C-alpha cells in the first residue's frame, strides 16, 4: 500500500 | 490512614467464620477495600482474628 515499500521491492508479477 | 490495630473496626468487616465481607454488602469504597484486605492479613498473622469457625 505504501509507495516507500515499493521502493525496496516492487509488486511481484505472477 | 486505615490501620490494623483498631480491631473494633475489623470486627464490623468480617463474618462469624472469619470471612472478609466484600464491598458489595457494606458499600465501602474500593480504595479502602484493598487496604482493609491487607490490614486483616496483618492481623491474621498476629493472632487477632480467627481464620475459620473451625478453631
Amino acid at each position: 500500500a505504501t509507495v516507500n515499500q515499493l521502493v525496496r521491492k516492487p509488486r511481484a508479477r505472477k | 490512614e486505615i490501620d490494623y490495630k483498631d480491631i473494633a473496626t475489623l470486627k464490623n468487616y468480617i463474618t462469624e467464620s472469619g470471612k472478609i465481607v466484600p464491598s458489595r454488602i457494606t458499600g465501602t469504597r474500593a480504595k479502602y477495600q484493598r487496604q482493609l484486605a491487607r490490614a486483616i492479613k496483618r492481623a491474621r498473622y498476629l493472632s487477632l482474628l480467627p481464620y475459620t469457625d473451625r478453631h
Binding site: - | K5, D6, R42, Y45, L46, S47, P50, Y51, H55
Partner: protein, 106 residues
C-alpha cells in the same frame, strides 16, 4: 531514613525477661543515630487461635526510626532467640507517635 513498626511477641513463661530485651536492643539502635517513637508494654493477651501449643501471649509494640544496620542483626537475633516466637516488621509512611487502641482502652 526508613520508619519501621516492629511487632514481636514473647513466650509467656519468660514474661519477666521482657524489660531486659527492651533496653539491650535500644542501646544498639540509639548509638548508631537511631530514633525511637513508641514503646508500649501490654502484658499477657488472649489469642485468636493457639500457636506453638500455648495461650495468653505477651505483646510488645514498637516504632523504630533507624538506618538499615539494625534490620540485618535484629531479625536474626529474633530467630536466634527462643523467647520470641513471632517476629514481624513493617515499613510505615512517616515517623508517627500515637498510642495504640489497646492502650487507650487498657
Amino acid at each position: 531514613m526508613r520508619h519501621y513498626e516492629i511487632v514481636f511477641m514473647v513466650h509467656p513463661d519468660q514474661s519477666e525477661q521482657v524489660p531486659g530485651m527492651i533496653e539491650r536492643y535500644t542501646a544498639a539502635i540509639t548509638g548508631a543515630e537511631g530514633k525511637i517513637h513508641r514503646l508500649e508494654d501490654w502484658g499477657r493477651r488472649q489469642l485468636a487461635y493457639p500457636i506453638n501449643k500455648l495461650h495468653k501471649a505477651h505483646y510488645v509494640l514498637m516504632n523504630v526510626e533507624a538506618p538499615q544496620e539494625v534490620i540485618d542483626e535484629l531479625e536474626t537475633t529474633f530467630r536466634f532467640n527462643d523467647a520470641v516466637i513471632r517476629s514481624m516488621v513493617m515499613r510505615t509512611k512517616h515517623a508517627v507517635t500515637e498510642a495504640s487502641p489497646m492502650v487507650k482502652a487498657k
